[PDB]
């Protein structure tokens, strides 16, 4: 659309979740040429939505897929492919090179940010309208990292959070505000979260909100609210005792708002939440211990009340199937009064758990908010690790 976007609506009433799109990438990859991806996200253009993910430069079935469990290699790009098609060697478009990304569209065209390099000489290049325009070196030389999901723009301004430093320590997270590709401004992490890792975001009423990972000492979730106009921000935790990170302790009756709810150490998983008062929904794995299942629970006022519980659920995928990363996205350009809220779930396959195959790849599964209360299905990746042997 020839004019930048504004976030002018609020969320629609989230009463159940319908299916939006699921590629069956791993089921199709026992016989077409699908690339091994990991870390998916889905982000829309004014004209189409498309799945994204980091590639590993090899197909599921080809010999170089052995060891795609390694997060970082100079063979990974951010690639897009049409909704619910597989990332296949032939329909996949490359966006930019490197091992951590984040991309979003500003109303006019799209930005895409790729981070690359060795852990202590890594570098970000912010592409905008498929041309490189800015580069950022590491500020702390320890695996410089950005969102792994859709970033969000308002009036030409798209906040990105980055983190460089350790996911065990204090690390140095830093919020940037780009416009048309250039560094407008940036800010150090302000507010109460201990460590910020890997956020997923959304926008409503001129506010960009983000749910993230406390990989340091938190089983609850640091949340960052950004004012795109003031180019300013806070961090805090989700008050609700329903813990969404994973691994997890049992859920308290009273969680904690301003510090990491403790129990688990140096471990997390990327995840999201829609924080909108009575109409709040928190996604989390069904497993306490590992990436199995995905549940969506209505927990009214979860961000604020430190004693909040579910009033309604929805299982996205059974505990006896596998889950993984999750982040949010919205069709910002979509006719209506409000924003249909949506999310994706990475279905991870292979190693380390299904170790009989030497690879690790995944599937997208994805849902969006239905105001009617629709019946539920649960949505398995679907492949049999035994046909690849």
């Amino acid at each position, epitope marked *: 659309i020839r004019d930048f976007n504004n976030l002018t609506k609020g969320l629609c009433t989230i009463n159940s979740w319908h299916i939006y799109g699921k590629d069956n990438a791993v089921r199709i990859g026992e016989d077409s040429d699908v690339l091994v991806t990991r870390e998916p996200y889905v982000s829309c253009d004014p004209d189409e939505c498309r799945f994204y993910a980091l590639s590993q430069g090899t197909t599921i079935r080809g010999k170089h897929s052995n060891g795609t469990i390694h997060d970082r290699s100079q063979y990974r790009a951010l690639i897009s492919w049409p909704l619910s098609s597989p990332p296949t060697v032939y329909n996949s478009r490359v966006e930019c090179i490197g091992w951590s990304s984040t991309s979003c569209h500003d109303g006019k065209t799209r930005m895409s940010i790729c981070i690359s390099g060795p852990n202590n000489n890594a570098s970000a290049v912010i592409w905008y309208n498929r041309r490189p325009v800015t580069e950022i070196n590491t500020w702390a030389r320890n695996i410089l990292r950005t969102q792994e999901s859709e970033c969000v723009c308002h009036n030409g301004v798209c906040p990105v959070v980055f983190t460089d430093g350790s996911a065990t320590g204090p690390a140095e997270t830093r919020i940037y505000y780009f416009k048309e590709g250039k560094i407008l401004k940036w800010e150090p992490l302000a507010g109460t979260a201990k460590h910020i890792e890997e956020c997923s975001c959304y926008g409503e009423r001129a506010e960009i909100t983000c749910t993230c990972r406390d990989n340091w000492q938190g089983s609850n979730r640091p949340v960052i609210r950004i004012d795109p106009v003031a180019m300013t921000h806070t961090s805090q935790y989700i008050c609700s005792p329903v813990l969404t990170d994973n691994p997890r302790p049992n859920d308290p009756t009273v969680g904690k708002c301003n510090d990491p709810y403790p129990g688990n150490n140096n471990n997390g998983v990327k995840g999201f939440s829609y924080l909108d008062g009575v109409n709040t929904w928190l996604g989390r794995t069904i*497993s306490r*211990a*590992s990436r*199995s*299942g995905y549940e969506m629970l209505k927990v009214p006022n979860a961000l604020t009340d430190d004693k909040s519980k579910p009033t309604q659920g929805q299982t996205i995928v*059974l505990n006896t199937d596998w889950s993984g990363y999750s982040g949010s996205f919205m069709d910002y350009w979509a006719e209506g009064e409000c924003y249909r809220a949506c999310f994706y779930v990475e279905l991870i396959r292979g190693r380390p*758990k299904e170790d009989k195959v030497w690879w690790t790849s995944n599937s997208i599964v994805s849902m969006c908010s239905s105001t009617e209360f629709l019946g539920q299905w649960d949505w398995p990746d679907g492949a049999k690790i035994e046909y690849f042997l």
Partner: nanobody, 120 residues
Framework: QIQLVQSGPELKKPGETVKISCKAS????????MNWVKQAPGKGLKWMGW????????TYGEEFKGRFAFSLETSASTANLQINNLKNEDTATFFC?????????????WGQGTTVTVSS
């Protein structure tokens, strides 16, 4: 909480087959798979495999493939072990634990056991 009970302890002479049961109180059977652990008076705890109480997919640890069969009576929220062509080597106490996760890496909750004595 979850309260799995197991059948009484049998005596079966070499060659036979025994039905060993786990009946699930506490949770919703289908979203948590059954784990089966053997405890000889020897090694200590051994994993025999899992059962996906959703589809019925069974997984067996190598030493267990073939003479053993995890099965379920879904309806009863029951899981069963079956040792066929019984060896006096199988003389031991078996457990059904409940797999916290997909495949049953952690086993939150264990039944009380069922002791088989293979003997003439």
């Amino acid at each position: 909480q979850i309260q799995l009970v197991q059948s009484g302890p049998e005596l079966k002479k070499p060659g036979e087959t025994v039905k060993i049961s786990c009946k699930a109180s506490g949770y919703t059977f289908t979203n948590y798979g059954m784990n089966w652990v053997k405890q000889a008076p020897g090694k200590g705890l051994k994993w025999m495999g899992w059962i996906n109480t959703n589809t019925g997919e069974p997984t067996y640890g190598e030493e267990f493939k073939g003479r053993f069969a995890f099965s379920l009576e879904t309806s009863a929220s029951t899981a069963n072990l079956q040792i066929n062509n019984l060896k006096n080597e199988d003389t031991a106490t078996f457990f059904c634990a409940r797999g916290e996760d997909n495949f049953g890496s952690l086993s939150d909750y264990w039944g009380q056991g069922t002791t088989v004595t293979v003997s003439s």
